[PDB]
Amino acid sequence: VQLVQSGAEVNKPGSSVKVSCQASGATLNSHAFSWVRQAPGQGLEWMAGIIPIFGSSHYAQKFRGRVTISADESTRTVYLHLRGLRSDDTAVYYCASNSIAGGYYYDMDVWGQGTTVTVSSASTKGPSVFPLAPTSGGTAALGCLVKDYFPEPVTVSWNSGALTSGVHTFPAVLQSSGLYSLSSVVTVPSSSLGTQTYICNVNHKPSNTKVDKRVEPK
Amino acid sequence: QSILTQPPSVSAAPGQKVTISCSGSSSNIGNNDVSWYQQFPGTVPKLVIYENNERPSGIPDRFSGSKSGTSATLGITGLQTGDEADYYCGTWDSSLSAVVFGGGSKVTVLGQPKAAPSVTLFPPSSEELQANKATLVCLISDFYPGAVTVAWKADSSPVKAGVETTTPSKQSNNKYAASSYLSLTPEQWKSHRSYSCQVTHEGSTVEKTVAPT
Numbered sequence: 001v002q003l004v005q006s007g008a009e010v011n012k013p014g015s016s017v018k019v020s021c022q023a024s025g026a027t028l029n030s031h032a033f034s035w036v037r038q039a040p041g042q043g044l045e046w047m048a049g050i051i052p053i054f055g056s057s058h059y060a061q062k063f064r065g066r067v068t069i070s071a072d073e074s075t076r077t078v079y080l081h082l083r084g085l086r087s088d089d090t091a092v093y094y095c096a097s098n099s100i101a102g103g104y105y106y107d108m109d110v111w112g113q114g115t116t117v118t119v120s121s122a123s124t125k126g127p128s129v130f131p132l133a134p135t136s137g138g139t140a141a142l143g144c145l146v147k148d149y150f151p152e153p154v155t156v157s158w159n160s161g162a163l164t165s166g167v168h169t170f171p172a173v174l175q176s177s178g179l180y181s182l183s184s185v186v187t188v189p190s191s192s193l194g195t196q197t198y199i200c201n202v203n204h205k206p207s208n209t210k211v212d213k214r215v216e217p218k
Numbered sequence: 219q220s221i222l223t224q225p226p227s228v229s230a231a232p233g234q235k236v237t238i239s240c241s242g243s244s245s246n247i248g249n250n251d252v253s254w255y256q257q258f259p260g261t262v263p264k265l266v267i268y269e270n271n272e273r274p275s276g277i278p279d280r281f282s283g284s285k286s287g288t289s290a291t292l293g294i295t296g297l298q299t300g301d302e303a304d305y306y307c308g309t310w311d312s313s314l315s316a317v318v319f320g321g322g323s324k325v326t327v328l329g330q331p332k333a334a335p336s337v338t339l340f341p342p343s344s345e346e347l348q349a350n351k352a353t354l355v356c357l358i359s360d361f362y363p364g365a366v367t368v369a370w371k372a373d374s375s376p377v378k379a380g381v382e383t384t385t386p387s388k389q390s391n392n393k394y395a396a397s398s399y400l401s402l403t404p405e406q407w408k409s410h411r412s413y414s415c416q417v418t419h420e421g422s423t424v425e426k427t428v429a430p431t
Contacts, residue, residue, distance in 0.1 A: 034317060036263075041385060043220065044255070044263060044306050046317040060316045094262065103250040103310020106317050109265040109274055132340040132355060141338045145346075145355055168359060170397045173384045181382070183355050183397060185338060 001025065003095055003112035010118045010151040010206065016083040019115045021095030023076045029053040031097040032105035035069060035080045039091040047093075050078060051105050058102050085119045092116050122150045122178040126207040129200070131215040132183065135190055142193075142215050143185035144200035148177070149207075156184040157201045193217050221246065222307055222320035229326040234297050238323045240307035241289045246318060250310040252290040254283055257322075258303045259364075259388040266305075267292060294325070302327045326363075332420050333393055335361035339415045339426035342407055352407040354400040354428065356415035361386075364394035367418040372410045 006020040021033070034049040048059045048069040057069050068081040078095060093115045096108030127149035134140040146154055156169045163186065172182035184200055202211045223241045230236045240252065254267040265274050267283035270290065282293040290309075294301055307320040335358045342352035358366060364386040370377035383398040398415060407413070412429040 036319075043322040044257075044308075044319045046308070046319055049317065058315050058317075060318075061314055102315065103312070103317070106310060107253055107265065107268055108255070108263070108308075109268075111262040111264075114262060128346075128349070130343040130346045130353075132343060143340065143355075143357075145340075145343070145353060147346075147353065168357070168395065170357060170395060171384055171387045173382045173397060173399060175382050175399075181353075181399060183357060185357055 001097075001110050003097060003110055005093075005095055005112040005115045008116045008118070008151075008153065010120075010124075011085050013085055013087060013119060013121060015085050016081065017085060017117055019080045019082075019093055019095075019117065021078045021080075021112050023078070023097065025076060028071055028073050028076050028078065030099060030101065032100050032102075032107070033069075033071070033078045034096050034098075034106055034108055035093060036096060036108065037091040037093045039088070042091075048080070049102065049106050051100070051102065053100070056102065058106075082117070087119050087121075089117065089119045116152070118151050120151070120178055124207055125150045125179065126209040127154060127202060127204055127211070129202050129211045129213045131200075131213055132185065133215060133218045134188075134193055138190050139187050140190045140193055141185055141187050142198055143183055144202065144213050144215060145181070145183050146172075146202050147181045148175070148179040149181070149204055150179050151206055152180060153205075154180070154182060155203045156182075157203075158184070158186055159197070159199055160201060163198070220321040221311060221314070221318035222309065224305075224307060224320035224323045226321075227324040227326065229328050230297050231328045232297055232299060235293060235295045236297055236325055237294075238292045238305055238307075238325070239289060240291065240320045242309065242311075242318075243288050245313035246288075246309045246311040247285060247290055248288040249312060252283065252285050252307055252309045254292045255306045255308065256303050257306065263306065297327060299327045299330060301325060330362070333360055333362040334422065335359065335366060335417050335419050335424055337415065337417050337424050337426050339428050341413075341428040341430075342402075342404070347404050347407070350404060352402040352404050354402065354413055354415070356398040356400070356417070356426070357395075358397065358417050359389065359395040360391070360393045361395075361419050362393045363420070364388065365419070366396060368396070368398040369416040369418070370398070370400050371414045371416065372406070373412065377413075
């Protein structure tokens with residue numbers, strides 16, 4: 001049994017977002033579905049639920065009037081509609097199910113992978129990529145700085161994915177400016193610096209931008 | 219301000235037993251079944267107890283649960299290092315007609331060997347300086363437990379502005395990583411003899427330094 005949710009959403013304050021959750025089963029009537037969110041480093045918060053077989057839906061007081069949960073049996077998809085978005089609605093939203101056949105129906109043993117919803121006044125901005133030029137115990141460290149971009153995410157690979165051992169791409173930091181920055185570093189044998197070419201491949205789909213930055217020794 | 223109340227954290231050594239309480243009222247725990255969820259850093263929650271004391275198929279028998287009146291408890295006997303995670307209780311609340319979660323409790327397994335952070339500090343790149351900007355990059359990895367304090371110095375003076383530090387993130391090897399950035403003007407970078415990133419972990423510090431030269 002699997003639940004697959006839709007991709008990351010990015011919204012301006014006051015706007016609305018719709019997140020989907022597609023079930024792997026043949027029907028939705030065999031389960032009860034819940035939507036739960038979790039902000040960075042904070043706790044789980046149950047928002048709403050729906051039990052298709054009974055056409056019943058429930059909502060946490062905190063979200064009444066702003067949230068709507070719907071179900072489409074023809075496509076076995078459940079939806080979460082959130083209106084009047086606030087910056088503090090920024091979080092990972094999960095859909096979860098429980099097999100039945102409201103407390104007697106809601107439970108969450110199967111969880112979707114989650115959908116990130118970012119609410120900010122910031123506007124889309126491609127990243128500026130800078131090389132972090134190359135040492136301890138015969139090993140050197142080199143990398144790429146991916147500065148001031150919005151919104152998440154940014155993926156980084158090295159040498160088109162051919163270089164993976166020793167690679168460490170760090171989670172981005174959300175700056176006081178509302179923009180993100182992250183870095184990727186690779187530890188390589190110092191002797192390789194004189195031959196092996198090193199290029200970091202930065203991809204920021206939100207801006208349809210990709211940068212391949214060559215990193216050479218100073 | 220969760221409707222259900224849990225202790226912020228519980229700790230014990232391997233082999234011992236830990237218990238996590240979850241208090242509520244008649245409308246929720248008192249008249250409805252309680253479930254417990256386990257969540258490892260950066261992973262989706264997993265149901266470990268439902269119907270107050272039932273273990274979902276597959277969950278080790280060292281996990282147990284109970285409910286008496288308006289409060290519930292999660293127990294973990296023979297505590298293992300692999301049990302270090304956040305745990306949440308949840309139940310239906312009849313007065314609100316909604317599911318409610320406790321605020322979560324962090325379970326720490328004591329006595330584990332500590333791992334000092336590996337620190338790499340990069341100076342501003344020539345390209346960035348040519349763009350009239352300057353960022354020092356401090357990358358911290360392979361430390362455990364996942365908690366560090368990052369301080370920056372210009373020469374020997376504490377830097378209190380322009381710093382952005384991430385919270386620790388769990389690595390694939392179960393150790394932690396974090397990064398810190400120091401934004402400066404090209405003139406500030408070139409004006410000092412050096413800048414340093416100091417990473418304090420479990421009482422000891424690892425410091426890296428870079429210089430305009």
